[PDB]
Amino acid sequence: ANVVVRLLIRRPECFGPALRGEGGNGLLAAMEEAIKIAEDPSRDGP
Amino acid sequence: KGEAIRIRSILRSLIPLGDLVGVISIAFQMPEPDMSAGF
Amino acid sequence: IQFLRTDDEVVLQCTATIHKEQQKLCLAAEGFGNRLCFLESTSNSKNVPPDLSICTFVLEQSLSVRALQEMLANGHRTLLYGHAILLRHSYSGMYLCCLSTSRSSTDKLAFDVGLQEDTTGEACWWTIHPASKQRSEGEKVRVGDDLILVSVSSERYLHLSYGNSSWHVDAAFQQTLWSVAPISSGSEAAQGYLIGGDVLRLLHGHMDECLTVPSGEHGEEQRRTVHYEGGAVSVHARSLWRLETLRVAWSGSHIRWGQPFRLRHVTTGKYLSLMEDKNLLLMDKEKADVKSTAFAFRSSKEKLDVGVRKEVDGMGTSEIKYGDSICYIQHVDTGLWLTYQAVDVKSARMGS
Known part of the structure; x- marks a missing residue:
């Protein structure tokens, strides 16, 4: 667990872009966006 | 142990608590069957 | 090739590329009044001099991580990669540490660095790690080597978080190459010799006339004037002049004759400049050009040596003493020399 946490904190791009980083706010907005992507079929593979 | 406190603090700084409770509060719909490939 | 020892003043310098332009910065901190650390542009010193007095840091002790853990449970040593160093502020006297607060809401994973009074706890020490492939763990550090500091x-x-207008250093998970530049290696600096980067006072051998400025009895227009005084002013605070050497590496070296240096008034924070249209005045760092502020010390009145030396890599040789030394100030552009006058009219001369 310690080394996995070390690697995940040294490489921040392993987390989601809408949760970690100077873009998306956090997990709340990330998963609400995910729900709305699930709801609208215009963002999938036809 | 101190490194345990450090790891817990890192995890808390990563994932806040308000975010956690807001994500818990979604109140998924419970259905005529539905699809299990969603939330 | 010189190995970093213990109890020596160093500078935590780093490189930053902004506007596709390179700049070199200190790790600096005011200390008294502001705990957090900031940056100081050590490069571009021809027009604005940096504040080396808050740029520099001293290595208090140098112990390994396991010896530090044993100290937690309970001469001049050399510095090796992997040790857990202790950085103390030179002026403020406090110790550089990692605060448990987060000021920048952008990087929600980092903390802020600053100065703290006590050294107890493992929240103040730092460990050096190699930054290059040529160098590994367990070897001796030398001058100019790039390292990485870890809490x-x-x-x-010790990350250099880039921001729109907040060039603030944090404790993040992104490595930042922090080069070290020595200042004073703690050599055999005898009691009484002149060391660069120091503040001092200048008196006369037979008149005890100290180079001062008017006190706070008037405004800054009056305090900007420079003159001589005597009596109790020798022990005042408005009569201290600090010599800032131009080079940032080994700025706390022994002052040799004929080298340029800036004259700063630590009481107001202005630098002693010379404009040809008048006498000398005090101008802030924003316009303190080196060609107008850099002065030098000579042993005689002549111009035998002007373009001789540019830099010497080392602590230097003990030349100028505090006890018995008769120096002459000389400007790099005009080459004028100090002279006392009798501009004071006879109306209130004896009392003023």
């Missing part, structure tokens, strides 16, 4: 408790790198 002991926070376990976070």
